Amino acid sequence: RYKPDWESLREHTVPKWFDKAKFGIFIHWGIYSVPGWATPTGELGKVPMDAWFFQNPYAEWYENSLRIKESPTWEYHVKTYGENFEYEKFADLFTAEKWDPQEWADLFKKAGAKYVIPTTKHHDGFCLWGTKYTDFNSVKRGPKRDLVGDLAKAVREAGLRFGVYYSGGLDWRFTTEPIRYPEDLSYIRPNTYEYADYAYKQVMELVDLYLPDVLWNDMGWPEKGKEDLKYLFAYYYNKHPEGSVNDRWGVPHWDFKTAEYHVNYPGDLPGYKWEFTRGIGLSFGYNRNEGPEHMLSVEQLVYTLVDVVSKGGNLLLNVGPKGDGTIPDLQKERLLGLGEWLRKYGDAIYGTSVWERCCAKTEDGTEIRFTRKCNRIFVIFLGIPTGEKIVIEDLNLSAGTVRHFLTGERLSFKNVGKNLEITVPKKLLETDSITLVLEAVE
Amino acid sequence: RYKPDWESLREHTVPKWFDKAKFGIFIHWGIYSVPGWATPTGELGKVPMDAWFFQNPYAEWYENSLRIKESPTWEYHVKTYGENFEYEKFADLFTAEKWDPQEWADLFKKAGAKYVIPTTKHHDGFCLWGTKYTDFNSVKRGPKRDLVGDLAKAVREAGLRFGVYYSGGLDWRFTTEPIRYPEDLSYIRPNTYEYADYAYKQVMELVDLYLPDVLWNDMGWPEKGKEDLKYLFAYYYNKHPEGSVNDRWGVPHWDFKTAEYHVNYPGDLPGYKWEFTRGIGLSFGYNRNEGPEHMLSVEQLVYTLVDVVSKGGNLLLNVGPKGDGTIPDLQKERLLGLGEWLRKYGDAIYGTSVWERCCAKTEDGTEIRFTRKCNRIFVIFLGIPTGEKIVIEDLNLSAGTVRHFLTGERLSFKNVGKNLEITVPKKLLETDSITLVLEAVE
Amino acid sequence: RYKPDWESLREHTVPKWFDKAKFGIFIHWGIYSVPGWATPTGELGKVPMDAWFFQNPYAEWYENSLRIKESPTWEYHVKTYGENFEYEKFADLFTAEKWDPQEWADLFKKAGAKYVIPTTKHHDGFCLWGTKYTDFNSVKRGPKRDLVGDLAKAVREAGLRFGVYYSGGLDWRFTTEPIRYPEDLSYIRPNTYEYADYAYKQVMELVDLYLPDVLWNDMGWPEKGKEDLKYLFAYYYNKHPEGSVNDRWGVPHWDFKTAEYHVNYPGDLPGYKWEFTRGIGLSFGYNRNEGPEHMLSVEQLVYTLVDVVSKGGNLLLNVGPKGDGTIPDLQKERLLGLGEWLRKYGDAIYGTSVWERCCAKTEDGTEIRFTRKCNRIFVIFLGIPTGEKIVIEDLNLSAGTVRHFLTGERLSFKNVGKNLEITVPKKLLETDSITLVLEAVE
Amino acid sequence: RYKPDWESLREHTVPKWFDKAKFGIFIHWGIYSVPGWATPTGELGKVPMDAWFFQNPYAEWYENSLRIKESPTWEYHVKTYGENFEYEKFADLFTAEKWDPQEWADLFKKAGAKYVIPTTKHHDGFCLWGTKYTDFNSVKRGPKRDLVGDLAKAVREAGLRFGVYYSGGLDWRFTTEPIRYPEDLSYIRPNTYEYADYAYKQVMELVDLYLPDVLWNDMGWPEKGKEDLKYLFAYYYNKHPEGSVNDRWGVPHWDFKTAEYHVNYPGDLPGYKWEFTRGIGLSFGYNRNEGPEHMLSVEQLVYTLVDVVSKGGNLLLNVGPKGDGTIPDLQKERLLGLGEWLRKYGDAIYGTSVWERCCAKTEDGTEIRFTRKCNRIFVIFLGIPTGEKIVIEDLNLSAGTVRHFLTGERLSFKNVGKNLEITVPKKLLETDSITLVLEAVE
Ligand SMILES: C[C@@H]1N[C@H](CNC(=O)Cc2c[nH]c3ccccc23)[C@@H](O)[C@H](O)[C@@H]1O
Ligand SMILES: C[C@@H]1N[C@H](CNC(=O)Cc2c[nH]c3ccccc23)[C@@H](O)[C@H](O)[C@@H]1O
Ligand SMILES: C[C@@H]1N[C@H](CNC(=O)Cc2c[nH]c3ccccc23)[C@@H](O)[C@H](O)[C@@H]1O
Numbered sequence A, B, C, D: 001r002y003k004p005d006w007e008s009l010r011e012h013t014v015p016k017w018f019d020k021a022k023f024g025i026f027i028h029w030g031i032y033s034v035p036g037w038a039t040p041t042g043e044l045g046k047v048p049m050d051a052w053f054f055q056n057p058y059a060e061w062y063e064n065s066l067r068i069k070e071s072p073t074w075e076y077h078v079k080t081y082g083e084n085f086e087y088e089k090f091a092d093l094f095t096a097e098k099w100d101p102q103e104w105a106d107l108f109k110k111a112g113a114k115y116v117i118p119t120t121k122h123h124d125g126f127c128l129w130g131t132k133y134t135d136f137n138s139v140k141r142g143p144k145r146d147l148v149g150d151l152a153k154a155v156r157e158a159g160l161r162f163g164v165y166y167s168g169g170l171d172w173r174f175t176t177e178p179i180r181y182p183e184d185l186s187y188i189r190p191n192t193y194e195y196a197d198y199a200y201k202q203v204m205e206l207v208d209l210y211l212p213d214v215l216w217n218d219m220g221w222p223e224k225g226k227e228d229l230k231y232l233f234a235y236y237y238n239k240h241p242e243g244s245v246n247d248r249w250g251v252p253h254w255d256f257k258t259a260e261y262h263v264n265y266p267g268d269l270p271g272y273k274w275e276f277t278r279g280i281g282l283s284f285g286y287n288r289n290e291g292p293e294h295m296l297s298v299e300q301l302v303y304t305l306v307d308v309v310s311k312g313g314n315l316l317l318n319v320g321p322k323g324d325g326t327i328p329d330l331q332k333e334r335l336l337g338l339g340e341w342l343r344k345y346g347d348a349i350y351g352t353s354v355w356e357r358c359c360a361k362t363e364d365g366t367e368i369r370f371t372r373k374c375n376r377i378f379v380i381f382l383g384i385p386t387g388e389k390i391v392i393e394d395l396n397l398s399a400g401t402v403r404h405f406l407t408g409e410r411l412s413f414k415n416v417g418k419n420l421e422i423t424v425p426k427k428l429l430e431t432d433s434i435t436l437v438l439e440a441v442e
């Protein structure tokens, strides 16, 4: 048994399956998905925090933006829904009438994802399962359906791992004042013993009802409730050893760390398991204002995943569905394109380990990322070189044998000074999709 | 922003308006106002604490006195209302049928008060506003009206500041046993996490609904909830910088200290902002047993205010209304008499600062109090000397020019040894009301 | 009597004398003054923190810099003194041969400072009084003399207040590794209970031997000793109620806050008493590498003092003496120039209060600052306008009379709209020194 | 950079080198080595704890045993040395006359150890480096020499890693009463803040002087000093990221856990890195009373190492030198025998990982252990089967090919049901040393 204390919980380390999975889907879906609107201002880490809450690109922060009068959101809301339409009222319009979980799980599997994590309760405090601790949930209002439960069955049926996202740190059902500056987060929080019990009970309920593969908390854990985590994590791991927990609880233990857009993104191998998270666009919740100008292209998604993976992380890519339960085509296209590249190069991604270095670049600037599997070293070019002579800056190989990953075709190479030169016949180069992938073997 | 920590909250100091206001009205009004009865035993600080709770002169402690069987209150209650009439039942008789807030605010303005503070919830736990945290409040029972809200609108309309009194330390809705000796207060308290959340939520609600100018807590704050105060005070000050908080929370921060009847009354200038509080009689809640023998006379009120003001404090004088919402004539007379003296000498009170010393006395014992405004020094005699030669013991002046405050008439004076001698023509002396006021200028 | 608890200690506020003084002299003098060397990189707040400790402009940090091999300091040191020359050896070369405390105190009085505060122990742990808790002090090594005591006697004889600076948060006699990045400050500290005791005993000793007017701590207080400050502060204030403490203790109590170079510098009225400190140059300890290019000019010193005072602060200007005890000419001249300015304009500085706004500016870019003394409002221009026509933006006066400070000459003005226009006769303008000053009365 | 907090320190995991090393040498050497005497009662975990301290088989506990009047040790001591001969006197007889650190390091390298860890200070408080915090150390007494430093230099020159063992939880220089029962350990400890500081300063000093590869603490850490470990650990890892700490600190962080004799020994895959330690005999300190009857034989040493490694651990085998610095022949021979075995079979040990199961057994009772190196699975029998027909119970392979490790000879096998059958040609069998080893590939 794991015991209820940090020294003992330290024994649990990130499970094998998570380390090997590399790619998962995040799903931010809630009553905010109905207005589904935000100012697509920019990437977290690049927008000045003096403006951020006032021009918030995270559409799921709609209620908070709505409480800031004379915020683009406030204006949009009054013209669209009216001054007398309270935010909570959206739970009645959140009907998920066109929702088909098996259809979601299938798309996620086709996309190459090995795990799925939906928002069981985001900052607005509305719960997507039949919790017994509040009536502001999807069984009693809106869909009249246990979304978490139904989605979990669907994802598992598809053979994918299922985790849960819970907003332990924020619950706007316990505050009245909006967050306007980062500073406000230090005091506009539920704060009561009551809320700390609520959060503990709700996560315990998620563990009991769905035994998730990942407990993904956000925004820290209520100070008054932090000690409870020793008990909750021991309870969880004892029921599910292969379960995992992220790093946003504000306590000693965690199985993997997280980075969001520019925030906490590692420049090199970090030395611990981590996971990068971002929306396909700038929001997590569905944003009707985003167009392709705001989203990653398939090529960019692939480069993202590869960079993240070569630095030891998993990519937890977010999808933001509509109030009706459908996934916007802009997002679907991208998921399928990524899936297509993973069907082809999966073997250089899935189940891989980091190598001695994550990165290299060609003489003319083509970035290169490395992954490994025992003695086999995968060389992933972010893009496909045009010529056949290829010069890799600052790399020597002691493999004696380098092959073209897609064909298996052995290739010609030599250590030329502090560099590595290789010849790739344009006919092979012509077969690669978004990345030229070579495979060395020492 | 103020941050949620004592070092940061230390930045907030008592607002200018409070320092300059000098006089405010306290209002203890609740369901205890209906029986409106107590043994007018004496002044707090003068009654032996071995008798106090058994012969309690604070009529608002009626429920506690009622729980002590064979207490004068218990006897009175049984003969008047019956053994089977529970205290809570008074919320149904508390109807405030003759209540007119604008009439109260007007009387308070005429009385010279610059701020008003009613009991939003006293020790019996009954709430005079539509709190969502209990049904034992004035909207659901008794008046079927938000007294706090309605009074706040009225006081503001009158141009007066509005604060709130909250009983954080005691709530007899969470105990069954009465307080019989001071010692009992150390353990007969709500004590739960639940009550600590309740108190925090209720004060947060008062801040949200009415944004008061003063948070006046009484009887300390629940131990389990003390840390919450960092968050509540930062939240409050960030919404209302010119807001203020008293010293009865039992935590590091406070904007002004308090003294009650003899308790904590300063003998000289104390070095910090404070406020003296007392009833016009011996009770705060309306007491039908008090007659004029038990109340301060206008002259005494004036002497009180002047003494307090000259020592840097504000006087927070209590009015105890009846169950019907009316203010007893004995109290009204006194408020108006004080008002009349303030209309005449306000300038030597309002907006003043302390001088080098608060006090002096004449050769024949007439007490003298000093206040200041830049270079002008007000000399207030508690009473009006009969002769014209006046000798002030242990005072020298370096003003060269002393005037009679009401007329402006320059007067004759000289430093005669360790004393100050001045001649005030009986015709001027004959114009002063309760106090001879001179005005020096160095 | 103050009791040893934060609630009680809050009763003590900044004493009058400190609020009215406005200008004090800081003295960083120690064995680091012997080598007197630093690379003058720039001002704190503007030099990138990843470079700061590697090219530290604070010459008093010489020892820390010496501990970073191949840092400008290391190279300089080895070339000048050799590798076999440990930092501590400077305690013996520290002889203060030409030191004359009365000359120092005369100079500070001429400069217009009203208080003086020498480093009793800086980060290197060397003590400049005969402490009984360490032999690494000035009585036993170098000067063979009680520098603190002798200076206090001279300062007090000159009529000035005397404080003490003590590095409670850092002591390099208890660590080996140097600070290279700001983050190091979180773990490279003495850390022991023994150090917490030592610090306590040393500050208590300073209170016992010299009863300073200000306890100026730096770099926070040892975590293990924080609770000790309740006792130390109560002990200090009960012996000296007009004593004061700054805000670098990291506990709930402080009498005035501080800002250093750009750090925590307020852009407008803060709402609490504070004090600004900086070197005449970019270092506190004497740096023989600085030239006038690195120093504030008398005019800038004057503008610094005016901006600071208008914002309610005091300026604590640092002078960095030489190992021999003499004050470099570049620093002595600026002290003098500032003293000259204070002799003419002091009445618009000493004893003033903040006005409604700290700042304004003329239609042509000349900045303005305000100070107050009752009904008198000082208008201080940071420079001397060339034309007799002066348009102050976004300002209106209801004074009726505006004089020209140095001559007293009533002047012609009128609120022309959202502005205020005044005519200053070139004859007057030409009489002012660094700042044109007007005085307005309401 | 690691920050001084448990959450941040969790980012540091067991370094690769420690995981791959598998075998290290422990050295308990101190003044207790002079008397070198203990009653060899039995193994920890099997001797009743109500007798254990009274007939302690750990000769390094000599002083504690001496403090129990009429314990075998007391009687022995008095007969051999006399009553007027205090334990501390052995510090002077501790001369290490024949000590040669390079011979030790040569021997450990031959034995196949990849790291070495000497006792820098055991329970008796005697230090074997020239610490500046006590005079009871090897530079000032006995050896007149820095044992730790000199040994580190020799170990590192031989290519091995160097760690340090420090008795942070016990120091008999700070107590008088001996431990008689396990319960005593709860209150008979130094207990003072001074001791907590001393321990901190001593481990910091070891990090500063030798930057060990492993900080091996024993008996927990002083309660008053636990919070110090956040700083010490961050300080250590920021200077040496490949450094490591064990799990005897009693705080949230550790890089590998430990088991001693029977205590905490795992029966199967634990799921975290750990290390097993034991003496060649029943004592850590040299015990001249032990004969080969009390020692593991080379074969048992080999079986211990295999069981340990198959379970993911490292074996930390203790050798107990004599006061003169020589290693008893009984211990030197076993080290050698083990080294011989590691030279032949090392490739199935160093650098391996655990497989799906640690263990198996042949139909006839011969135990089996598995280790892994990618696709290669080592099958290590604890002994050499006599017949060429080998039936392994409850095992099936999907490898297709199984070689005989030392010769490489492909072998005949087939899953006969719930078992696996392999034919090992007596010619091969007869070539193996202590263990038959097969290698299987998938
Ligand atoms: C996945 C996204 N996480 C956001 C919160 N996190 C942050 O903004 C940045 C952050 C990084 N690490 C953290 C740890 C604790 C709290 C916040 C963060 C949420 O506010 C968004 O709504 C969305 O759910
Ligand atoms: C204004 C009056 N205050 C009383 C409580 N205070 C005390 O009896 C004396 C007191 C002075 N300072 C304090 C601080 C904390 C708690 C009590 C006191 C209340 O019990 C009365 O009912 C009334 O509201
Ligand atoms: C007056 C100067 N103070 C420096 C320490 N303070 C800082 O570097 C910056 C600072 C501003 N406010 C603070 C509060 C606590 C700790 C540090 C600072 C010292 O390091 C310099 O040697 C010098 O004594």
Ligand SMILES: C[C@@H]1N[C@H](CNC(=O)Cc2c[nH]c3ccccc23)[C@@H](O)[C@H](O)[C@@H]1O
Pocket (backbone or CB within 6 Å): D028, D058, D060, D061, D218, D219, D220, D247, D248, D258, D259, D260, D263, D277, D284
């Ligand atoms: C390596 C040996 N360690 C002993 C201390 N530990 C124990 O007796 C048993 C033990 C196992 N795991 C632990 C964790 C913390 C404290 C003690 C133990 C010491 O008493 C011996 O002298 C020897 O140094």
